[PDB]
Amino acid sequence: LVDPLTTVREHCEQLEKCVKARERLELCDNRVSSRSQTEEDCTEELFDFLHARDHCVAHKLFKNLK
Amino acid sequence: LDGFRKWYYNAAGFNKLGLMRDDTLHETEDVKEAIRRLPEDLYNDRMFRIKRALDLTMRHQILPKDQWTKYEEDKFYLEPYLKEVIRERKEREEWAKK
Amino acid sequence: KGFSYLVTATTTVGVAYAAKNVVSQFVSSMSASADVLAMSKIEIKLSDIPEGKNM
Amino acid sequence: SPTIPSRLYSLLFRRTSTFALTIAVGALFFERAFDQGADAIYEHINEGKLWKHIKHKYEN
Amino acid sequence: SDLELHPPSYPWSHRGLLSSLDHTSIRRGFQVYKQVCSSCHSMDYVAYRHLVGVCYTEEEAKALAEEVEVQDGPNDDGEMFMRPGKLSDYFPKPYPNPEAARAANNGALPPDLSYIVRARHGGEDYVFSLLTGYCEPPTGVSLREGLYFNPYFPGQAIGMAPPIYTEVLEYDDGTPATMSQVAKDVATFLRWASEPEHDHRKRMGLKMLLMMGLLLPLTYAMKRHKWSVLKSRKLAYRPP
Amino acid sequence: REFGNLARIRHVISYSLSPFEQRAFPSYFSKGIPNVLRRTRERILRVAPPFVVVYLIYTWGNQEFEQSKRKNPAMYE
Amino acid sequence: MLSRFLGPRYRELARNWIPTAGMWGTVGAVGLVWATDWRLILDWVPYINGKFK
Amino acid sequence: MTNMRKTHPLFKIINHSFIDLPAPSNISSWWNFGSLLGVCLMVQIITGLFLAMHYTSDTMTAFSSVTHICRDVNYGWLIRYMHANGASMFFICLFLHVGRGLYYGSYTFMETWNIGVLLLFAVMATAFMGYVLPWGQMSFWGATVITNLLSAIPYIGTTLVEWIWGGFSVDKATLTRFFAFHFILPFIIAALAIVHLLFLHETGSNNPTGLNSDADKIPFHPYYTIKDILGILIMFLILMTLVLFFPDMLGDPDNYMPANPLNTPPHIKPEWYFLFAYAILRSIPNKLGGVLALILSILILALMPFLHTSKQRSLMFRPITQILYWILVANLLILTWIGGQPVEHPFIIIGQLASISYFSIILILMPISGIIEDKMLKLY
Amino acid sequence: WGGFSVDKATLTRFFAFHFILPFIIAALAIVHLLFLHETGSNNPTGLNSDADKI
Amino acid sequence: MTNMRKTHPLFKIINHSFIDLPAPSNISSWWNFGSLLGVCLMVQIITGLFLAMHYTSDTMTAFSSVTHICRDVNYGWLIRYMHANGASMFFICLFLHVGRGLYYGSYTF
Amino acid sequence: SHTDVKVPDFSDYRRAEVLDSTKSSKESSEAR
Numbered sequence A: 001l002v003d004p005l006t007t008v009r010e011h012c013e014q015l016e017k018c019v020k021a022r023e024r025l026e027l028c029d030n031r032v033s034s035r036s037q038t039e040e041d042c043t044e045e046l047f048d049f050l051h052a053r054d055h056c057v058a059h060k061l062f063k064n065l066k
Numbered sequence B: 001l002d003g004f005r006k007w008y009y010n011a012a013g014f015n016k017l018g019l020m021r022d023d024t025l026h027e028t029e030d031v032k033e034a035i036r037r038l039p040e041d042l043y044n045d046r047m048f049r050i051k052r053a054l055d056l057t058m059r060h061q062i063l064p065k066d067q068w069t070k071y072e073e074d075k076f077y078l079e080p081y082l083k084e085v086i087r088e089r090k091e092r093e094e095w096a097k098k
Numbered sequence C: 001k002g003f004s005y006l007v008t009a010t011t012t013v014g015v016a017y018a019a020k021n022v023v024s025q026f027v028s029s030m031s032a033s034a035d036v037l038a039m040s041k042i043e044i045k046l047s048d049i050p051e052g053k054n055m
Numbered sequence D: 001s002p003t004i005p006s007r008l009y010s011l012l013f014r015r016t017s018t019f020a021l022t023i024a025v026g027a028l029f030f031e032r033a034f035d036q037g038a039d040a041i042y043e044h045i046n047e048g049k050l051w052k053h054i055k056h057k058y059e060n
Numbered sequence E: 001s002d003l004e005l006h007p008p009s010y011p012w013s014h015r016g017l018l019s020s021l022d023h024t025s026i027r028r029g030f031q032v033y034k035q036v037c038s039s040c041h042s043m044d045y046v047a048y049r050h051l052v053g054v055c056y057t058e059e060e061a062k063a064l065a066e067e068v069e070v071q072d073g074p075n076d077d078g079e080m081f082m083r084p085g086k087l088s089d090y091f092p093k094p095y096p097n098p099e100a101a102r103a104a105n106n107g108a109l110p111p112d113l114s115y116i117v118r119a120r121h122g123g124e125d126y127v128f129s130l131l132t133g134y135c136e137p138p139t140g141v142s143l144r145e146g147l148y149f150n151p152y153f154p155g156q157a158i159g160m161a162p163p164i165y166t167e168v169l170e171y172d173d174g175t176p177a178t179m180s181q182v183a184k185d186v187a188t189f190l191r192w193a194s195e196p197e198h199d200h201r202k203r204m205g206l207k208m209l210l211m212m213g214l215l216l217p218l219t220y221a222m223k224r225h226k227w228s229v230l231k232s233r234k235l236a237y238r239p240p
Numbered sequence F: 001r002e003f004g005n006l007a008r009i010r011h012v013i014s015y016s017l018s019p020f021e022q023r024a025f026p027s028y029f030s031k032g033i034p035n036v037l038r039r040t041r042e043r044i045l046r047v048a049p050p051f052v053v054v055y056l057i058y059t060w061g062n063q064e065f066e067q068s069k070r071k072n073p074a075m076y077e
Numbered sequence G: 001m002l003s004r005f006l007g008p009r010y011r012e013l014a015r016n017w018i019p020t021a022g023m024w025g026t027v028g029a030v031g032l033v034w035a036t037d038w039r040l041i042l043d044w045v046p047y048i049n050g051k052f053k
Numbered sequence H: 001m002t003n004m005r006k007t008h009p010l011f012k013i014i015n016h017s018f019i020d021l022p023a024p025s026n027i028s029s030w031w032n033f034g035s036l037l038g039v040c041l042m043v044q045i046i047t048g049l050f051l052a053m054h055y056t057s058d059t060m061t062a063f064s065s066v067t068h069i070c071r072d073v074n075y076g077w078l079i080r081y082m083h084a085n086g087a088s089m090f091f092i093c094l095f096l097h098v099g100r101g102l103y104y105g106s107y108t109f110m111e112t113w114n115i116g117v118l119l120l121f122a123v124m125a126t127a128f129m130g131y132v133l134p135w136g137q138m139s140f141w142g143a144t145v146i147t148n149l150l151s152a153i154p155y156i157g158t159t160l161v162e163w164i165w166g167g168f169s170v171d172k173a174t175l176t177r178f179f180a181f182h183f184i185l186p187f188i189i190a191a192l193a194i195v196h197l198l199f200l201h202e203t204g205s206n207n208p209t210g211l212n213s214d215a216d217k218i219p220f221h222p223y224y225t226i227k228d229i230l231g232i233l234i235m236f237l238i239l240m241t242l243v244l245f246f247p248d249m250l251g252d253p254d255n256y257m258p259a260n261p262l263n264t265p266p267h268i269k270p271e272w273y274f275l276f277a278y279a280i281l282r283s284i285p286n287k288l289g290g291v292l293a294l295i296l297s298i299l300i301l302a303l304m305p306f307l308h309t310s311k312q313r314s315l316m317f318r319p320i321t322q323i324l325y326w327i328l329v330a331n332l333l334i335l336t337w338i339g340g341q342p343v344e345h346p347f348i349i350i351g352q353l354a355s356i357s358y359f360s361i362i363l364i365l366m367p368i369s370g371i372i373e374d375k376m377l378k379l380y
Numbered sequence I: 001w002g003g004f005s006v007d008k009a010t011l012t013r014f015f016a017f018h019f020i021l022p023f024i025i026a027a028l029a030i031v032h033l034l035f036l037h038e039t040g041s042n043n044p045t046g047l048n049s050d051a052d053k054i
Numbered sequence J: 001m002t003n004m005r006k007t008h009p010l011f012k013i014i015n016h017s018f019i020d021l022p023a024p025s026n027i028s029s030w031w032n033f034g035s036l037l038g039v040c041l042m043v044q045i046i047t048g049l050f051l052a053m054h055y056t057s058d059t060m061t062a063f064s065s066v067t068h069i070c071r072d073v074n075y076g077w078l079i080r081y082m083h084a085n086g087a088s089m090f091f092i093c094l095f096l097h098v099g100r101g102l103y104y105g106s107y108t109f
Numbered sequence K: 001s002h003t004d005v006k007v008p009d010f011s012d013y014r015r016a017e018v019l020d021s022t023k024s025s026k027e028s029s030e031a032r
């Protein structure tokens, strides 16, 4: 069974500001993963990416559910 | 400060309703005593100007610009009576001191 | 005057004593009761928890 | 030819008792008419969602 | 992390100023709660007498009440006994005390889902975002057992595993039970359970708006009519 | 106290007409709009600067709060 | 506070009024300790301490 | 034949106070707020009376009783939401009443102003006890916070707050005594408001111009009767659209949970005006100092009539003090927003800057503004 | 009754009414004394007491 | 200087109502019952305020709350019995009040 | 003199049926 949430989310990562936040996300991801021992955890741009993605979802999801 | 005092006079707003400074100063006991000391024509003019002020403020309107009172012709009619009443009050106060 | 004012003074001493007792009565009544005095003095504590923990 | 508010004043509004009577009669009729109007606007703006709209699918 | 994710504003059918709830969605979210959410979360304030006339009919809600068992007493001999529930009975709690809830849910207490929309900021948007925002944690944080990542829960670590998924239950009307559909239905049902007076309140609001839009111009007309004699009064000063 | 001895008024003539003879809304727009912009212009420079600096302090506080919760780039290592 | 409370007449008025004002403050203090049963003052009076309050 | 309206004693009192009452003709919509406050007081009396008819004050049943009012009682949701949003509307009208008095110099009526300050005290205490009545999480925790503030008093506060608590924390005794006090206190408010109206009636009302209005007076009927009716309708519009469309806009979500002595919310955010009081408390970092700061921030209205150094009563003709007054309203709003916000930078520094600005404006800057205005107008 | 017999609703509403109605009694006692002050006070003889009043 | 007792508004109302009220000189002890009724009313106000301060109005807890007032609360038994006997004395004073009113022709007001 | 007192014009405030002074009332006053 297909999921409208997954299709809308895929369109959201296709959107421009979400994919810019996404590229910042994997950039800080290999920044953290390159270091071995640190107390560096970066949830902030993940929050930004989820914020933009879910904002676009809330704009363009509910027309599929009925 | 003639121009600055004129600007502050216009910005105060009581010239817009046709008042005077001595018209619009608040009534303390000395002020009521000096109003009682005002003569008949000045008292009648004061009360009519205040009544017109109440009417204009009720209607949320102001006088026309030509009918606005001007800084050059703002008579200070209540002032000498007010100074005399203040002098009498101060003299009574210093006699109460003694 | 001493006799009359001694009578008046004794009346107001009695009235003041009664009024102080009444007001102290009411403000002690609205104060803490026997239930909350009994439920606070003794606290049940055990040792059935592991080390480095909180309860 | 007297106008409409002229006839209302000549027939009902001059006497205070008749004024109160037409106030009460208009209160009844306006109460029901406004009830019908407001309800009709409500189920037209919310058609297909209320229990009185989806009721027939489970009543019978 | 003290930073929290603000839930987005979903365009609900009841989001409008005069728009009520979709009672079919309320019904669907009710069996979502019954077949999924009722095993952990209690419902202490919603009853079948509130269920009638909103999403189920009286006979359906009655039979739905007798499908579950309710403890009642005292007996003739003075004990408890299990009897079929009725419309007057409230929804059955899964645990008798919150200590049993914490024991069955490894130290986490599932709150009563009868005021959760009015209790959590964001409301049904927060509930939908919480139920649909489950994802793997980012590189940098490790969560111990019994804890799951959720960016919408404050503190980012929730005591719930994802409760819903695709085809988690079978709808009676044949609607495809996707995860988003199930979350939307249960969020609408939780909004109804938090505020059952929603439709009546909005109908009364429409009535109030129309009546006061009729009355305020008329009352202002009487105010200006009675005040007209002052506002057109003219003054003259005629000293000798 | 009551009407009759409130003030001493002389030579003052007041003219008024009946509410049924006159209108409840006499030129409500053609004279209302110049009057309301007159009042707004007269009393706009005493309220608007405090309210706009409240808006500036509000948005600056929110922005500084969000940068305070933002990550410090000093501690890469 | 005010300019009407200056000079020698009110000064000797306060001089005349200060002992009865001090006595009114004193009876206020005695009323306060008697009403509140203030132990910190009631343990120094010679007999009232036998009430244990 | 005689006139019953001046012959009958109850009727002559009603006539002399409400019917043939000489009032200034030019008073604006800001003078409707006293009648709005009285109407809202009566609305809360009736509404809370019904709430107490359907409400029980006991810790394990207070929240259940409130839920039973909301769900099982017919229109009980309407009654409770009317009560809450009408308390919000009551404090809105109270603040606009106080602002009217401050702007138009009505504080020169010393006895009326002091009775108004007493009314403000009683209304704030009543509303605090009403807020703790539904026994929510934030209700219980705000009660504990305010009682600890009372416990900040040296050598009396600990025993005084164990006395007020009826024990050692907020519990069943505290909830029941707060129910009794909340139910009873608006009747003292109504009696003291009768005293308020009597003290106002002794001297007459105040016009926005601040001048002698005896030259131009109108009866209270029917002008101010129909104006007050229109104001009542507008206030009912705002209140009822709040209740029926945004019943939680001025509310608190954490109040919709049962009170837990163990669990605490991450934030303690009471209602708007208590947010103001909480910010003026949180300004300076000491317990007794903050308590005195809150107490002086409320008593500063009673201290206001001694600070009037100007020769003109109202601020209609005083433009500099108009700027100072609107800056005062501005940092009232700022302090309310800081009370809403949590305790970080820059909310702290904005808090004490707003507090010092507010206190310095009321104490120092306003009489200096009046002196400067008088010396510009050749009155000093 | 608030229902079908004397129950919790009846007891709670009677509590509210019993709390509140003595204040209406107090206000009506104020009205009582106001009417009495308007009409004066009576004496046991039932006569005009204005000759001897203290 | 002014006479504050007759120039202050609340104070002149109090003076004209209760201080300088012209009262008949010959009124007997039956005329005290109005003041007794007012004082019993105030006593009922305060005493019932403390009772409702410690009272719960629910059928499961009304009787238990009354027992809690009479036993656990400090001298709440004295408060409850003062309330009950003050109600009884209120009706005693009411009956003697209406007895004065019927006997002495006070119903003409 | 008292005869100098002439009532000012009110045509900015009159209703539509009482604008002219050459038409008598009682055919419009009751309608108003």
Ligand SMILES: CCCCCCCCCCCCCCCCCC(=O)OC[C@H](COP(=O)(O)OCCN)OC(=O)CCCCCCCCCCCCCCCCC
Residues within 6 Å of the ligand: B008, B011, F041, F042, F043, F045, F046, F049, F050, F053, F054, F057, H319, H320, H323, H327, H330, H331, H334, H350, H353, H354, H357
């Ligand atoms: C000097 C200006 C001259 C303007 C001349 C304009 C043309 C005049 C001739 C044509 C007529 C146009 C219309 C006139 C309208 C009424 C007159 C007017 O606006 O006057 C200017 C007005 C009042 O002038 P006045 O008070 O005399 O200024 C003395 C200097 N203080 O003064 C003003 O408008 C200035 C107000 C400035 C207020 C700035 C406040 C900044 C700080 C706010 C802080 C708020 C709290 C923030 C939080 C604090 C704690 C963190």
Ligand code: HEC
Residues within 6 Å of the ligand: E032, E033, E036, E037, E038, E039, E040, E041, E105, E108, E109, E110, E111, E116, E120, E127, E130, E131, E153, E154, E157, E158, E159, E160, E161, E163, E164, E186
């Ligand atoms: C048993 C596994 C549960 C199921 C089935 C559901 N919930 Fe739950 N819930 C459960 C626990 C143990 C907790 C507490 C976890 C914690 O970390 O505190 C919760 C909590 C919630 C909350 C509250 C979140 C908050 O911010 O307060 C919500 C809104 C919630 N759960 C939603 C929810 C819904 C809608 C469910 C039905 C689909 C549901 N949960 C099922 C345990 C369990």
Ligand code: HEM
Residues within 6 Å of the ligand: H030, H031, H032, H033, H034, H035, H037, H038, H041, H094, H097, H098, H101, H106, H107, H109, H112, H113, H115, H116, H117, H119, H120, H123, H189, H193, H196, H197, H200, H204, H205, H206, H207, H301
């Ligand atoms: C429950 C709260 C209150 C009620 C019911 C109330 C009642 C009233 C009423 C009916 C009026 C007449 C309306 C008017 O003059 O505009 C009035 C005026 C007034 N009120 Fe209040 N009041 C309350 C609180 C306050 C407060 C908090 C203050 C001051 C801090 C205050 C001070 C005044 C003053 C000074 C006036 C005179 C205004 C004037 O003369 O124009 N009152 N009050």
Ligand code: HEM
Residues within 6 Å of the ligand: H041, H044, H045, H046, H047, H048, H049, H051, H052, H055, H066, H069, H080, H083, H084, H087, H090, H091, H123, H124, H126, H127, H128, H129, H130, H131, H132, H133, H134, H182, H183, H184, H186, H187, H255
């Ligand atoms: C005689 C008058 C009043 C009575 C009888 C009364 C009674 C009550 C009762 C029983 C409650 C609890 C019910 C509930 O919260 O659901 C309550 C709540 C409350 N009361 Fe009152 N009250 C009165 C006056 C006031 C006034 C004058 C104010 C404010 C100025 C006020 C403020 C509040 C508030 C804020 C609440 C909380 C409402 C909520 O939490 O939603 N009350 N009142």
Ligand code: HEM
Residues within 6 Å of the ligand: I029, I032, I033, I036, I040, I041, I042, I043, J030, J031, J032, J033, J034, J035, J037, J038, J041, J094, J097, J098, J101, J106, J107, J109
């Ligand atoms: C229920 C509470 C009542 C209160 C608080 C109250 C209060 C008072 C007071 C203080 C007086 C003045 C005392 C005096 O003049 O001797 C008085 C007198 C009077 N009362 Fe009452 N009363 C109450 C009930 C009643 C009742 C039940 C009646 C009659 C059915 C009544 C009828 C009268 C009359 C006629 C007087 C005038 C006595 C006279 O002129 O000598 N009142 N009342």
Ligand code: HEM
Residues within 6 Å of the ligand: I018, I019, I020, I022, I023, J041, J044, J045, J047, J048, J049, J051, J052, J055, J066, J069, J080, J083, J084, J086, J087, J088, J090, J091
């Ligand atoms: C605001 C005023 C009053 C309040 C708050 C109040 C409060 C209460 C409360 C809470 C109770 C139940 C507690 C208990 O009985 O143990 C009660 C009982 C009672 N009340 Fe009141 N009351 C007030 C005035 C009155 C008045 C004026 C009367 C009679 C004239 C009265 C007559 C009674 C009686 C007879 C009982 C029964 C006591 C018993 O059976 O033990 N009350 N009252």
